[PDB]
Amino acid sequence: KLQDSLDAGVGNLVDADLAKESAKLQSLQTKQQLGVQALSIANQSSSSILSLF
Amino acid sequence: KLQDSLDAGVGNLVDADLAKESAKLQSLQTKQQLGVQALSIANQSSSSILSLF
């Protein structure tokens, strides 16, 4: 029983809560796609003034 | 008569009541099958979160 308590305690210290990680994963993948889109938007700034010449 | 009394007394000290043991045996066999089923139920916990990924 003591060995089981020590192993369960190690699990309490280090184990991930995977149900929480699934939500973090979905939101981070959306955030990464939005960041790529935002970088594409920022990349376009130089071409705006080409029309002035 | 004294030898018979001593032998019957040893039987009073150590002999099992087998009619009582038959009931304990049936209930313990049911309890063991239920424990195997409960362990199977506990074994399934990790697979529940596979659906989240």
Swiss-Prot record, chains A, B:
Places the protein is found: Secreted; Bacterial flagellum
Protein role: Flagellin is the subunit protein which polymerizes to form the filaments of bacterial flagella.
Membership in a protein family: Belongs to the bacterial flagellin family.
Self-association state and partner proteins as the record states: In C.crescentus, the flagellar filament is composed of multiple flagellins of 29 kDa; 27 kDa and 25 kDa.
Record protein name field: Flagellin FljM
